[PDB]
């Protein structure tokens, strides 16, 4: 009870750099003689310091080695503090140490070897620190150990194979480390072992069969590892097992039927593995199961009606498997059920009526299956349903009422046969951030109540037959990012209130009856990425105010009545990957600096089917990395600019149906090695056929038909492999027509009329 | 899926003032409906176009997690850090553009194991180190614009560089 301990404690106090809560201040004020009354400090009957316990006291600094000078110390509890540095190597000197708990701190470096020499230590908690190095073989020789936490450190290397020696062990948890190698089989010899967590490591190889010998085992957690082979049937003999987590591994083969023997099981999660065959019916004998999922596996066969027996079941994930046959109608037997996911399977049949029975249901994912039939009206009675994904199925009928009382967030019912109108009560649920009915038969208007759900992020009504105008209520959405109404019968003017969506990154109105002046206000959206107005009744000149949207990856005005000349102002947008102006009334030349200001455009440039007149701008050469250029069906006049020899990413090039004349430059096609389809057809082109056409390896279809080309056909084309369709036709060509090649299966039509060709 | 997760990792490593990546929701089955992301008919990611998005940050290793990735455009951003060697793990990748960035460090030798590569532009960067010889191995390489980042160590003529007009080097502190 004398000075040495006092000095140890003081030297521990010093070295603690920060004490905001002022805990240690107690030590100062009480005095050195009364020290056994100090906060965190407790002594024995004889007056020696035994327990040092300080928890959530927010202490910073380092742990002074002076703690080794407290000899009678049994428990040292530092839990949940800021302590940094390395655990003092002199810690082996305590010898009376019962429990060392460093849990939730910043401690680093290798675990002191001294710790392993202690014969009195049962509870060792190092969890949640920075400790590096490996678990030494020496740990097997410290035999007083019962509970060892290693969780969430930097520990590496392999688990000591001699661990079975650690006879008294009840708990070993290494989870969230870098451990590699396999699981020591000797571990299966610990008969008092309850909890084992190896999860979140690199561990490999098979699960030890002898693990079937642990009869006190409650939690077995191997998840997020590299483990291979199959789940050992021996596991079926652990009767104390409440929780079995094998998920996120390489485990293969069928699920052991013997797993049906663990009836204390609550959580069984084997998901994200290679497992095969069909679910053993024995699994339905586990009636205490709350959480179960088989998802992300190769499992086949049906889902037996016997799932109805589980009844304590809360979360069920069957998704991303090969499951087939009828849907589990008896799913309504489990009223504790919250999450159910069958998605990504071949499951067919109909959802059960009285599905409304579940009530607690939060997530329903049936998406991507063979399910037919109507959405059960009884779904009105699921009041806790946040998420419904029925999308991509064969389902029929009309969307029922009751979605207003569900309080949903995500609804994807799309890609189905659904008919009727959109129930207006569906707008009575304001928490809906996703509404997708896309690709169905739904008919009606889009009512102004749409304005009712302000929280929405994405709205897809596309690929239905809907009609009427677009309600101005649309403006209220505010945070919508995607709006897709395309492929419907919507009519009238685009409401100017759409300018009120400042968060909208895409708009597809295409294939509709929309018309009239595009509202000026709509150009105030700077965040709009993709805009498809194509295939509509829009007329009049292309607004220069289109420049006001400067970030556009995608723009399609195609298939409309648009008037006049391409506004030069459009130079403002250089982010365009796809510009489709094609199929309109557009007149005049292509502005050069617009074609220049698009420098890098990676995909699609289509001006085709317009009244455009002029030479093809040399600035088309400035366009590089562009895959497709269609200028076809226009009034373009002069010869092909050699300037475009600079675009090497061109795959398809269509200049057909034009007034272009002069010789086809070889110099320009040298660059375009990559071309797959080339259409020069129906022009005034004269001179020979470029020999570099033979240097095109990816050329499939080449159409030179209807031209003035005077040359002998170049053989180069003959032996060319990838060529399939060739068009020469009306032209003046001379002499021998090549033999071996696409000329073998060639149709006479492609050569006619050519006048004189020997053959 | 895994690809959506990879791009989500990329998104987490990047500061996005222009809200370009707002479209990216990790909870989706694929990242194919994400803007500035384009996939193929099989839903595997083909193109990623981030060019001129005014992003800032570091690249990520998970960029190797996109087997079908063909065109990768990060060009003209404030992105810093190095070029992950896992970019070599891309089997068919047609165009790699990191140009006009603050990226530093060496050009990984793994950049020579993509044999489908045509356009490689690393130019206008902080890149420092030696040129991988495997860039002479790939042979497709219709364009290599890499320049403006000090490297040296040599200028290889080893024979896929035999075809380069040498703006392709242009102050590499080269040779």
């Amino acid at each position: 009870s004398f000075e040495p301990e006092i000095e140890a404690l003081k030297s521990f106090k010093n070295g603690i750099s920060n004490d905001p809560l002022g805990v240690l201040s107690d030590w100062t004020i009480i005095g050195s003689l009364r020290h056994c009354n100090w906060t965190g400090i407790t002594c024995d009957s004889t007056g020696h310091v035994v327990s040092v316990s300080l928890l959530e006291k927010q202490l910073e600094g380092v742990l002074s080695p002076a703690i080794a000078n407290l000899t009678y110390l049994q428990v040292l509890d530092l839990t949940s503090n800021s302590f940094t540095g390395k655990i003092p190597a002199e810690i082996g000197k305590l010898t009376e140490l019962n429990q060392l708990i460093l849990y939730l701190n910043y401690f680093s470096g290798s675990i002191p070897s001294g710790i392993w020499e202690l014969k009195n230590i049962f509870y060792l908690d190092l969890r949640n620190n920075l400790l590096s190095g490996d678990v030494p073989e020496e740990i097997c020789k410290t035999s007083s150990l019962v509970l060892i936490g290693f969780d969430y450190n930097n520990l590496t290397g392999k688990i000591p194979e001699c661990l079975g020696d650690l006879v008294h062990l009840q708990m070993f948890v290494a989870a969230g480390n870098h451990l590699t190698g396999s699981i020591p089989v000797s571990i299966g010899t610990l008969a008092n072992l309850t909890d084992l967590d190896l999860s979140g490591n690199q561990l490999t190889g098979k699960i030890p069969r002898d693990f079937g010998n642990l009869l006190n085992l409650q939690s077995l957690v191997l998840t997020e590892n590299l483990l291979e082979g199959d789940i050992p049937a021996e596991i079926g003999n652990c009767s104390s097992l409440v929780q079995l987590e094998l998920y996120d591994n390489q485990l293969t083969g069928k699920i052991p039927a013997e797993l049906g023997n663990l009836v204390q099981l609550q959580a069984l999660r084997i998901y994200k593995n290679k497992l095969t065959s069909s679910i053993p019916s024995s699994l339905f004998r586990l009636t205490q199961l709350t959480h179960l999922g088989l998802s992300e596996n190769h499992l086949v066969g049906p889902i037996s009606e016997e799932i109805g027996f589980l009844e304590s079941l809360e979360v069920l994930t069957l998704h991303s498997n090969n499951f087939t046959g009828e849907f589990p109608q008896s799913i309504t037997n489990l009223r504790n059920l919250t999450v159910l996911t069958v998605g990504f399977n071949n499951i067919s049949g109909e959802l059960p009526a009285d599905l409304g029975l579940l009530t607690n249901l939060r997530n329903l994912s049936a998406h991507d299956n063979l399910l037919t039939g109507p959405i059960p009206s009884s779904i009105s009675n699921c009041t806790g349903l946040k998420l419904l994904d029925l999308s991509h199925n064969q389902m029929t009928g009309e969307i029922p009422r009751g979605f207003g009382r569900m309080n949903l967030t995500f609804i994807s019912i799309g890609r189905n046969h659904f008919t009727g109108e959109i129930p207006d009560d569906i707008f009575n649920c304001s928490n809906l951030e996703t509404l997708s009915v896309a690709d169905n038969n739904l008919t009606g208007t889009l009512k102004p109540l749409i304005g009712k759900l302000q929280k929405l992020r994405i709205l897809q009504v596309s690929y239905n037959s809907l009609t009427g105008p677009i309600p101005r209520e649309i403006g209220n959405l505010k945070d919508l990012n995607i709006l897709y109404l395309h492929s419907n019968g919507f009519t009238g003017r685009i409401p100017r209130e759409m300018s009120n969506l400042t968060l909208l990154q895409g708009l597809r109105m295409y294939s509709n009856d929309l018309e009239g002046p595009i509202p000026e206000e709509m150009f105030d959206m700077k965040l709009l990425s993709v805009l498809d107005l194509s295939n509509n009744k829009f007329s009049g000149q292309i607004p220069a105010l289109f420049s006001k949207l400067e970030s556009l990856t995608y723009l399609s005005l195609q298939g409309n009545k648009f008037n006049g000349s391409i506004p030069a102002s459009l130079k403002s947008l250089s982010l365009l990957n796809t510009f489709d102006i094609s199929d309109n009334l557009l007149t005049g030349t292509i502005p050069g600096e617009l074609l220049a200001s698009l420098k890098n455009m990676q995909l699609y440039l289509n001006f085709s089917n317009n009244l455009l007149t002029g030479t093809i701008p040399k600035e088309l050469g400035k366009l590089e990395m562009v895959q497709e250029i269609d200028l076809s069906n226009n009034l373009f006049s002069g010869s092909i600019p050699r300037s475009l020899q600079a675009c090497k990413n061109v795959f398809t090039l269509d200049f057909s149906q034009n007034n272009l004349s002069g010789h086809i430059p070889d110099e320009v096609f040298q660059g375009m090695d990559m071309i797959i389809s080339l259409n020069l057809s129906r022009n005034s082109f004269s001179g020979e056929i470029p020999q570099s056409f033979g240097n095109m390896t990816h050329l499939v279809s080449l159409d030179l038909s209807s031209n003035n080309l005077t040359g002998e056909i170049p053989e180069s084309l003959a032996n060319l492999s990838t060529l399939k369709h060739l068009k020469l036709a009306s032209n003046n060509l001379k002499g021998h027509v090549p033999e071996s090649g696409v000329f073998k299966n060639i149709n006479a039509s492609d050569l006619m009329g050519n006048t004189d060709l020997c053959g | 899926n895994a690809e959506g997760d990879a791009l989500s990792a990329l998104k987490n490593s990047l500061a996005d003032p222009n809200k370009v990546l707002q479209s990216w929701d990790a909870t989706l089955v694929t990242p194919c409906t994400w803007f500035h992301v384009t996939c193929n008919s099989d839903n595997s990611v083909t193109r990623v176009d981030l060019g001129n998005a005014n992003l800032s940050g570091q690249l990520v290793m998970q960029l190797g997690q996109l087997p079908n990735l063909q065109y990768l455009e990060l060009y003209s951003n404030n992105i810093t850090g190095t070029i992950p060697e896992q970019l070599g793990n891309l089997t068919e990748l047609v165009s790699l553009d990191l140009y006009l960035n603050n990226l530093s460090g060496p050009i990984p030798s793994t950049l020579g194991r993509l044999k489908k590569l045509r356009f490689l532009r690393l130019n206008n960067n902080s890149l420092s180190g030696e040129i991988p010889r495997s860039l002479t191995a790939v042979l497709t390489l219709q364009v290599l614009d890499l320049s403006n980042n000090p490297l040296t160590g040599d200028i290889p003529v080893n024979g896929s560089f035999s075809l380069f007009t040498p703006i392709s080097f242009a102050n590499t502190k080269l040779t």
Partner: peptide
């Protein structure tokens, strides 16, 4: 969570399912 009470039931996650659009 103390090391004594052991690994609880909710200490492990459920497999989350994707969203179809």
């Amino acid at each position: 969570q103390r090391l004594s009470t052991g690994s609880r039931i909710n200490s492990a996650k459920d497999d989350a399912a994707g969203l179809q659009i």
